Amino acid sequence: ELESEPIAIVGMACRLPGEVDSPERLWELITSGRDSAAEVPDDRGWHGNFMAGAGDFDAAFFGISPREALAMDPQQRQALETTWEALESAGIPPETLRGSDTGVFVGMSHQGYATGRPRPEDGVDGYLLTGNTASVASGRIAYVLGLEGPALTVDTACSSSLVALHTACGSLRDGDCGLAVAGGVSVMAGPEVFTEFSRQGALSPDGRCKPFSDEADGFGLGEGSAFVVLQRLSDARREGRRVLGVVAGSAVNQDGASNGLSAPSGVAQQRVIRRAWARAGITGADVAVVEAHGTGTRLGDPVEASALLATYGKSRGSSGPVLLGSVKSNIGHAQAAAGVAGVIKVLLGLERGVVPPMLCRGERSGLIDWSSGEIELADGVREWSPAADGVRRAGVSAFGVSGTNAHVIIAEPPEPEPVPQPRRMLPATGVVPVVLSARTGAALRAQAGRLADHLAAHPGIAPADVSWTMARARQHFEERAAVLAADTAEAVHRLRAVADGAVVPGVVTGSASDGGSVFVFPGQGAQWEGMARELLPVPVFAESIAECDAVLSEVAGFSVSEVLERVDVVQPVLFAVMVSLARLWRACGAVPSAVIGHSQGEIAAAVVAGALSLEDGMRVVARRSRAVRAVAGRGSMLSVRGGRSDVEWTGRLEVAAVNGPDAVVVAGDAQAAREFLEYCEGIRARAIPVDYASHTAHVEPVRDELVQALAGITPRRAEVPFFSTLTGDFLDGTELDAGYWYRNLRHPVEFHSAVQALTDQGYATFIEVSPHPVLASSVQETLDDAESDAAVLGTLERDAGDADRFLTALADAHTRGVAVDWEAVLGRAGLVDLPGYPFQGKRFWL
Amino acid sequence: EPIAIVGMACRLPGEVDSPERLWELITSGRDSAAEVPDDRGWHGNFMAGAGDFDAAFFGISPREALAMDPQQRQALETTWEALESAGIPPETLRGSDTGVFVGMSHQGYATGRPRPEDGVDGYLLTGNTASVASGRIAYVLGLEGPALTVDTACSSSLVALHTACGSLRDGDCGLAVAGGVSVMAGPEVFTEFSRQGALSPDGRCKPFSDEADGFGLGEGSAFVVLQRLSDARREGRRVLGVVAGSAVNQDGASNGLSAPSGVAQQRVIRRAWARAGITGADVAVVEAHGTGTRLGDPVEASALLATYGKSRGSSGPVLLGSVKSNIGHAQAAAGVAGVIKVLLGLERGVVPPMLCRGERSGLIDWSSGEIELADGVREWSPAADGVRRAGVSAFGVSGTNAHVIIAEPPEPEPVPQPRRMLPATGVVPVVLSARTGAALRAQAGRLADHLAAHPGIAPADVSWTMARARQHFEERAAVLAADTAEAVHRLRAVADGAVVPGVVTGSASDGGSVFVFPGQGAQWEGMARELLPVPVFAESIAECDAVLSEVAGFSVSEVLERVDVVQPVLFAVMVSLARLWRACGAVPSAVIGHSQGEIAAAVVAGALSLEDGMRVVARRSRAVRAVAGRGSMLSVRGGRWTGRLEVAAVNGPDAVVVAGDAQAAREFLEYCEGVGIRARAIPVDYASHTAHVEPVRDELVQALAGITPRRAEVPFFSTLTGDFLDGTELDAGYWYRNLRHPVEFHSAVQALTDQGYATFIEVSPHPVLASSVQETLDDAESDAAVLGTLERDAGDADRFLTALADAHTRGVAVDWEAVLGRAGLVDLPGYPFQGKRFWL
């Protein structure tokens, strides 16, 4: 039950010359047949291939000071940003990795950064050693990401990154980690490496590698950053990762005693090729493509070609000629990153099912025996013949100038076992949310512009995939935005709206907060005929509604009563929609730090908090609302825009609620009200459709009777902190007896007071759990008084009791920082390749 | 499989140049703290010879040696030493799947614009890029397994050791070199840690002491040779200990890249026990990262308490220590250093001690009494298993951690030992070699110093180790000895350049060896009877006896002569001595013969079967007997009655044999006694190589007419024709013209000399022609050497062992495994490196 388990490549990232800043841009360069040879930049201080942004670093993203960033070797910084991008390609939000066996293996050597004396002004003392010692290149990644498997920096020159891959594959097979980042980085800071190869006469004047060409006259120095994410195939499939290829086998060895430390030996190259085949249990006939070391040196190219001839050339059998190429023909010699660059080239190929081409410049080298016809240069895009197995495979080679050699077999990934897919809460409406996050607003804007450009340049991409990917395969940062969209084109328009600062429907913006969420249960006038009907397909919701039907009939003979009103029906139905909407938020991941209610709302809130069972909570609102129909006739209520005290004629009307700084309820005698009302026809007052006045003495008649009816209820300790609008503070759920429920009907509702307290205590998000926003505007006004940044949210709305509205609410709750379990909401779609985090890099170059 | 440590080597501060010196420094409670050297540029711990390097040894230019990072030079010389500790002649590893794993980081060498006068242009980069530190060992030594350099700061060499083991388990290589080297060339590292305030002003690491106040910086080489236990046992290597389990993890998010985390340390310790299939109770010793940091040491102690301190259950407190207390923080070699320290202990069966200073840190919960500081030497309790174990930690400042369980080597499955070729006589040869004469004397003195300081080590172990477990270089010397005192005495002679009995000196050479077969008077009564115990010899005498019985009656008449018996018996002794040389490794490039000796030479070369050769010498001899009585031959010192004596053989520039009629010889002798010309008769009544034998011709040529001359598998150089003969030319005629034409031996030795042969071996019971050959070589101004085999009144195993040693000193290939068999590998000084200082 143990063997060389296949290792899977689940992500990849690279920064390479020729303006390549992602695997996909590398594909463009290779199919274009453009190269990157250009003159050395002046901004370094002393022809070749150079990275666009070698010295740019989003230092603030990773919490690194600008002084330390200036001291960090540009290789340390590329490795750190490219590691991040690789995990994003694997679809792993890097936070989930903190405390993980994840290992880091970085191939690298020294390139002459920070060799002068430190200009004291720059103030890099205390940072320069750590910014430039090899082990830190790998240790820093594990520090910044909280990774806890092995972290090593390895130097074998040109093969460094393939040796790092080889080591990570053993680490994974051995149990030393369960996920690994492996790759290499180089940035030619100083001119020492270029100078030594010039002196040797090893560099083409072009700056271009002409691999296997008659025009080969030396290699072109390059640089870059190339990283893959490795995982044992079993763990990959079990976690449903998107496998890009697999390392079927790999090998490492040494030239030994060649003719000069740098001299190449074809025999060594053959043996390393053959150990790889052995580890992978294949023969050369099973490999259609070879991505060679391929540096364009007159004497080395034939050495490499003779060993391919002696290995891949023989017994090709059924398999036609082997295709041969080298990515150095487009980007130059990327030194410590050369190997994995090659590996990312063949992986791009596997995606598209074709053999990646090479910039063939001129005629084949006359020094190579092509007479067998068994090796062909990959001149343009070609068919990738599977092997007799039906498996496509490639071979990648890196032969370092210190004599250590590597060869790796990359194979297409096996077919995944199909698994039963999880269900998506909320019926499908074609509308999908697409969420964005960055560490600043400029970065947030840039993310949105890039997603829009990608989706415009890549249409046909399934919006469900962009939705799932940006919610499940990306980390959520401080500054957020979300865009509802029914089809790709509507996404681009609204993503551009985020990008350019436009307010537009279907687009929301917000900052994520530490503080808790408070569920506001209003009651009052949240009802509308036909409410929340479109949510009865949702089992979480429908089930709550059904159990509510059971216990209502037993206590009031009533039920759904919305297949197609009056106070002792409306209140038992608004109770039911509110505890149901609450359970729906719960099952979508919004967990309440506290519950608060307005009058009857407090009964749904006590249920939602666990202080009263669903049964007792129904009985309390059924026999509280039957008891109010018994003091009908005389009595009514009115809303009065304008704050209390100013509204505070006596003995017939009194203040019965306070809802915000600019909103009060007054109640008392029916006629007496019309009096106040038509008085104000000359304040924006308005009367509530009521035949009685609660929170007044008109209710003392039903006291004792109510208290009795609800004497069998059993208040329990709450699971969620219940804030009493009566007491004005937190209250053990045992204290919610009939007395409390009478005193709730009689005493005045100090709701503005409670919202002020909860704002004082630092709660961040108020979610009105109701079929129509009733208190939301009043709460929003209270927060403006306290000059607060707390956010207020509705759930459903009249003409909006649909899933599309709850989806909108989920989108806004998440944008404010409420934890939406997007897995439970958008089930589990596939991972699509979308732009990475939009690093806001500044230049640092000592 | 378990990976075995089969060799080990280290250069460390405190004058430590070998694992034994480490044991010295550690058991005598001294430390190496001292001021920074002046000669480096710019308090700590420093290697004595950090900039010394034997560039000529590795064939490296002095300019390239100047450009090379001392870290690269030390790694090269220490890798050699570790290979010698393994008993592996490094040349036998050329073309081998041997892996090189080098832990290392940058340390400030070559940081300034180089003085053009230095001439480093073109070597600086190669001599300072990290990959070349391991790539160059693979290059110099021809190794072909993986070669990596790795940097995980203070854990580098244990991570290196961890990677090698996985490489060995994976079949990626079959032997690995692993370790770490650091040399504080410039002061950067020192300045940084000073600024941070982590460096004790003492320069001294005080691990787990209340007096801890920072660590002291240090440097070092520490390397071990690794091999799968199966393969080590097969090759019969000496296992110092086994890497039962190793683990590597990272601190992740500690309170700073440098901050230590105990959970991280606990987890890596427990992964290593899982790989090794043990629990903390089974480990008696922990060698720690130590350092002596006020805040670091308690994190390490807390993690050790939570693993090695829990659930010991009547196994006693684990012992605790850190070699940094004696040598400081070797940085990249800190780990293997600690490994070598616990290996030193495993040898002697005691827990190696630590220089504990002051009182135990009050920052540490000693209250369970389950962890005890390794005060002085202690008993190493084995575990219930019965296996002695130790744990070694190295925790990197980049946050990478390693813990390694070192265990005692398992008991070797015993195996029947190969037989020695020669009968044992308590006399052993100990052979010496190095690249220059100076180095040879140096190796001699260090072996004498070593033997003086460890008496009662067996001479047969010294013999076997020096002959089979070291490479043999250009300048050689051999010493014969029957006890250690005598070896010491003669080894001093070699060291002092003095001439003494028992001691031979010489230079190995490219040319081949010629087996020289005389006839003459090599015989003596009872010759070689002492070699009959040796099967290869006995079997050949016995097979001669048979063929001679069917051509005469005599046989093994070497117990309790005349011509038709002596020439047959000399023949059987020479061809048997030839077979003994060959079973001992000596390949003849060519054979040459003097008269009847050519028959021996033709049989040794395969041109005649043993029978046809016996037959030729038996008849040829009887032929002489027939035409005897009158006639005589005499030796005459001088270069080369007229028709009554002629020259019958020219043996050298000053030696001639004159033969003729018996009376005319008596006349030539009296004249010589008068005129003073040195001459003496040869006890014979015949005159061979004159017309005196013509009579018995046309008779032997008929008796030897059924001989079957075959083609020779060894070039036969005809003294007769003075050039190379196909063995099918060796017909009866030849064997007659051999008896009648005069022996032009001197001319043949000149000829072979001019073809570049290097070594002449007289395959005879007594060296008849050897002094003449030397005379011939002296005049050609030739550096070639002349060797004998047996000797009149010696002729036993001792004289043959002596001959083997002299042939080895001159370049002849002696098997040594065939002559000595297996014996014990013992630790003896390494190659005597002759380093000049290099430093930019």
> Is the Cβ–Cβ distance between A556 and A811 less than 8 Å?
no
Q: Provide, as residue numbers in chain A, all residues whose Cβ is less than 8 Å from the Cβ of B398.
A: 133, 135-136, 138-140, 151
3-state SS string over B631-671? CEEEEEECCCCCCCEEEEEEEECCEEEEEECHHHHHHHHHH
Q: Is A559 on the interface with B (CB under 8 A)?
A: no
> Is the Cβ–Cβ distance between B838 and B62 less than 8 Å?
yes
> Is the Cβ–Cβ distance between B760 and B784 less than 8 Å?
yes
Distance from CA of B399 to the nearest CA of A (A): 6
> Is the Cβ–Cβ distance between A685 and A640 less than 8 Å?
yes
**Pairwise CA distance, residues A229 & A340, whole Å:** 11
Instruction: Count A/B contacts: CB-CB distance under 8 Å.
Output: 201
> Is the Cβ–Cβ distance between B287 and B341 less than 8 Å?
yes
Residue type at A483 in one-letter notation: V
Q: Provide, as residue numbers in chain B, all residues whose Cβ is less than 8 Å from the Cβ of A251.
A: 172
Among B106, B196, B249, select the one facing A133 at the smallest CB separation.
B106
Distance from CA of B101 to the nearest CA of A (A): 10
B774 three-state secondary structure: helix
CA atoms within a 13 Å half-sphere pointing along the CA-CB vector of B473: 17
> In 10 A of CB A84, how many CB atoms?
24
Q: Is A145 exposed, middle or buried (0-12, 13-18, 19+ CB in 10 A)?
A: buried
Note the maximum CA span of chain A. 113
Both tokens assigned to B379: 């008993």
Q: Which residue of B has its CA nearest to A192?
A: B125
CB contact under 8 A, B145 and A253: yes
**Pairwise CA distance, residues B325 & B373, whole Å:** 12
B717 three-state secondary structure: strand
**Pairwise CA distance, residues A25 & A19, whole Å:** 8
Q: Is B471 on the interface with A (CB under 8 A)?
A: no
The CA-based dihedral angle spanning residues A260, A263, A265, A268, taken in that order and rounded to the nearest 10 degrees: 80
CA dihedral over A265, A267, A268, A272, signed as positive or negative: positive
Q: Provide, as residue numbers in chain A, all residues whose Cβ is less than 8 Å from the Cβ of B95.
A: 256
Q: Is B94 on the interface with A (CB under 8 A)?
A: yes
CB contact under 8 A, B257 and A404: no
Query: Which residues, including other chains, have CB under 8 Å from residue B308's CB and lie 6 or more apart?
Result: B269, B280, B283, B286, B318, B370, B371, B391
Q: Is A736 on the interface with B (CB under 8 A)?
A: no
The structure tokens 């740019």 sit at: A56
Binding-face residues of A in 219-278 toward B, CB within 8 A: 251-258, 261, 268, 271, 275
CB contact under 8 A, A142 and B399: yes
**Pairwise CA distance, residues A689 & B434, whole Å:** 113
Which of B238, B233, B429, B417 has the alpha carbon at shortest distance from B822?
A: B417
Q: Which residue of A has its CA nearest to B398?
A: A139
Please state whether A476 falls in left (phi above 0), alpha (psi between -120 and 50) or beta.
beta
Q: To which H or E segment does residue B325 belong?
A: helix B324-327
> Strands, DSSP E only, in A162-244?
180-186, 224-232
Interface mutation vs chain B, best among A96, A100, A104, A143, most B CBs within 10 Å: A143
Q: Is A109 on the interface with B (CB under 8 A)?
A: yes
Among B129, B150, B396, select the one facing A110 at the smallest CB separation.
B129
Distance from CA of B105 to the nearest CA of A (A): 7
> In 10 A of CB A691, how many CB atoms?
15
Among B121, B130, B196, select the one facing A110 at the smallest CB separation.
B130
Q: Provide, as residue numbers in chain B, all residues whose Cβ is less than 8 Å from the Cβ of A257.
A: 94, 139, 141-142
**Pairwise CA distance, residues A768 & A776, whole Å:** 6
Distance from CA of B368 to the nearest CA of A (A): 30
Q: Is A2 on the interface with B (CB under 8 A)?
A: no
Binding-face residues of A in 602-661 toward B, CB within 8 A: none
Resolution of the PDB structure in angstroms: 2.7
Among A139, A156, A199, select the one facing B148 at the smallest CB separation.
A156
DSSP string, A379-419: -S-EE----TTS--EEEEEEE-TTSEEEEEEEEPPPPPPP-
> Is the Cβ–Cβ distance between B103 and B333 less than 8 Å?
yes
A585 three-state secondary structure: helix
The structure tokens 């046992």 sit at: B233
Both tokens assigned to B697: 């011709």
Residue type at B124 in one-letter notation: L
Q: Is B352 on the interface with A (CB under 8 A)?
A: no
Strands A180-186 vs A103-107: parallel, antiparallel or unpaired: parallel
Distance from CA of B90 to the nearest CA of A (A): 13
Q: Which residue of B has its CA nearest to A405?
A: B146
CB contact under 8 A, B156 and A135: yes
**Pairwise CA distance, residues A498 & A486, whole Å:** 17
Q: Is A45 on the interface with B (CB under 8 A)?
A: no
**Pairwise CA distance, residues A213 & A329, whole Å:** 10
Binding-face residues of A in 130-149 toward B, CB within 8 A: 130, 132-136, 138-140, 142-149
The CA-based dihedral angle spanning residues A826, A829, A833, A834, taken in that order and rounded to the nearest 10 degrees: -10
**Long-range contacts of A238-242, Cβ-Cβ distance < 8 Å, separation of 24 or more:** A240/A416, A240/A419, A240/A828, A241/A8, A241/A10, A241/A90, A241/A91, A242/A10, A242/A90, A242/A91, A242/A830, A242/A831
Radius of gyration, alpha carbons of chain B:
34
Residue type at B115 in one-letter notation: R
**Pairwise CA distance, residues A814 & A800, whole Å:** 19
**Determination technique for this entry:** X-ray
Q: Which residue of A has its CA nearest to B135?
A: A402
Q: Provide, as residue numbers in chain A, all residues whose Cβ is less than 8 Å from the Cβ of B143.
A: 254, 256
Question: First and final CA of chain A: distance in angstroms?
Answer: 54
Question: First and final CA of chain B: distance in angstroms?
Answer: 45
B308 three-state secondary structure: helix
Query: Which residues, including other chains, have CB under 8 Å from residue A419's CB and lie 6 or more apart?
Result: A240
Distance from CA of B515 to the nearest CA of A (A): 36
**Pairwise CA distance, residues A502 & A481, whole Å:** 12
**Pairwise CA distance, residues A572 & A253, whole Å:** 78
CB contact under 8 A, B136 and A261: yes
Both tokens assigned to A739: 């007395």
Q: Which residue of B has its CA nearest to A164?
A: B148
Please state whether B14 falls in left (phi above 0), alpha (psi between -120 and 50) or beta.
left
Helices (H) and strands (E) in chain A — how many of each? Answer: 26, 29
User: Per-residue b/e over A263-300, b at no fewer than 16 CB within 10 Å?
Assistant: ebbbbbbbbbbbbbbebbebbbbbbbbbbbbbbbbbeb
> In 10 A of CB A340, how many CB atoms?
35
User: Per-residue b/e over B498-520, b at no fewer than 16 CB within 10 Å?
Assistant: eeeebbbbbbbbebbbbbbbbbb
CB contact under 8 A, B144 and A199: no
Residue type at B664 in one-letter notation: A
Q: Provide, as residue numbers in chain B, all residues whose Cβ is less than 8 Å from the Cβ of A200.
A: 122
**Pairwise CA distance, residues B422 & B801, whole Å:** 8
State the DSSP code for B242.
E
**Pairwise CA distance, residues A241 & A86, whole Å:** 13
